Amino acid sequence: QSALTQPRSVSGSPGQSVTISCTGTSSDVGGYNYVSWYQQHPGKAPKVMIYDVSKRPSGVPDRFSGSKSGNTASLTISGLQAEDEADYYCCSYAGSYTYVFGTGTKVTVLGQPKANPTVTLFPPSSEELQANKATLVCLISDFYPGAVTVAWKADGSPVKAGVETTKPSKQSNNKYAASSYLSLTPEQWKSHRSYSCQVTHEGSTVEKTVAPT
Amino acid sequence: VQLQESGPGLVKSSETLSLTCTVSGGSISSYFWSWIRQPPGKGLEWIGYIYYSGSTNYNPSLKSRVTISLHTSKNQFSLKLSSVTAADTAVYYCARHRNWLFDYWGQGTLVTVSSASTKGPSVFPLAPGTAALGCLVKDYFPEPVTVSWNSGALTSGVHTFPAVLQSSGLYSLSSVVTVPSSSLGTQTYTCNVDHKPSNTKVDKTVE
DNA sequence: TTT
């Protein structure tokens, strides 16, 4: 089945509220009330925060609440505290003894002003082309919050195959950076007129383009 | 009550990945017993679960490859994932599933899928207000590699990215430096790549 | 076989 759709990034200052959506289908999220939510801090196992749409396990603070509307579940965190910064996954029963997890949302508890990413797209080096290989390298730097969506295009047309993207990691200056690689053959690289790396960060999109030359 | 995964961290391509979960402080005579995985930097993926009575139910996209078994005399349950490729590289978690939720999770075990022998990286230049430049450190195994710039003298604006494991079973990473564009072709910028597992060092001046 |  298809993973449940979540936003990549949600954010708020300490004391504010955020809501995370989790969109499924009528055969999972909107088919049962067996929706659960999981919190994951770096390097740790997921930890259950909500089950049966709206119930809290013992020990989970009351600032976490769950709800549902049609085929969309929502996790709401009121009065954000610094320790709420983590990844959050919804999960739903999906019929005939199966479960499907959502794609995950990074919750950022804002401690800096937001920073837009600087995007540099490198074409394959002539040295790499001589090695009968081709990698486009899309470098994304100096952004906050640390969550970004990367999409690749070949002559304005989405390219899903041969894409590898790194989870954003903190730079030495406390903003984030991420990287995406599009792996092609030299012939693929030469056959197309243009290639683009499209970076989406907090509503805004930055696009860089490169062509064989 | 506690679950913990045991078994190897490195499996060869096209072989069977085997893990065991040992339950302590509790029996396996109730509930469901589940496996979930998470590729590095990506989302959770349910693999399957087994009911205490033996009934197995797996993710439909992994069905023909997955075996979950109970071992009651050891209070364990196991996972076998056949036909493994680099795409199966993930943190594998066991978890108890009770009353429609996953409540006690193991710490997880990273399983890397590769039949790669030790190999040193190819280093390719990422040639350039400010300008970004870098080095693509490609097709090495195993981790780690360390990258410095100008023998550690240049640290401002430097960022080295986490490694990606490609479909080949070999790792790649990039390291980048943001410098003033007026210094290009006068200042030299050299990435020093150190791959101890293959006894390899590469210096690459990028221009 | 199976909350």
Residue numbers in the entry:
A (entry chain B): 1 to 9, 11 to 30, 30A, 30B, 30C, 31 to 95, 95A, 96 to 210
B (entry chain A): 2 to 82, 82A, 82B, 82C, 83 to 126, 134 to 212
What does the paper say about this structure?
Among various ANAs, anti-double-stranded DNA (dsDNA) antibodies are a reliable diagnostic marker for SLE. Among the ANAs we isolated, clones 71F12 and 121G9 were highly reactive to both ds and ssDNA. The surface plasmon resonance (SPR) binding experiments revealed that they bind to oligo dsDNA with nanomolar dissociation constants, which were much smaller than the values of polyreactive 72H11 (equilibrium dissociation constant [KD] = ~400 nM). It should be noted that 71F12 has base specificity, as this clone exclusively bound to the thymine-containing ssDNA and dsDNA.
To clarify the structural basis underlying the DNA recognition by the 71F12 antibody, the crystal structure of the 71F12 fragment antigen binding (Fab)-ssDNA (5′-TTTTT-3′) complex was solved. Clear electron density attributable to the bound DNA was visible at the antigen-binding cleft of the Fab molecules, which was consistent with the docked models. The DNA was mostly recognized by the heavy chain at three anchor points (sites 1–3) each utilizing the thymine base projected toward the antibody. Electron density was only visible for a trinucleotide segment, which became weaker toward the 5′ direction. The thymine base at site 1 (designated as T0) is deeply inserted into a pocket formed by F33, Y50, H98, N100 and W101 of the heavy chain and Y97 and Y99 of the light chain, and is specifically held via numerous hydrogen bonds and stacking interaction with W101. The structure is only compatible with pyrimidine bases at the T0 position, because purines cannot be accommodated in the pocket. Thymine specificity is ensured by numerous hydrogen bonds including the bidentate hydrogen bond donation by Y50 (H, the heavy chain) and Y99 (L, the light chain). In site 2, the thymine base at T−1 is half exposed, but still makes extensive contacts with the antibody via F33 (H), S56 (H), N58 (H) and Y97 (L), with the critical involvement of double hydrogen bonds with N58 (H). The interaction mediated by site 3 seems to provide minor contributions to the affinity and base specificity, because the T−2 base merely stacks onto the convex ridge formed by S54 (H) and S56 (H) at the periphery of the antigen binding site. The conservative mutation Y33F in the heavy chain is critical for higher affinity because the hydroxyl group would cause steric impedance with the DNA backbone.
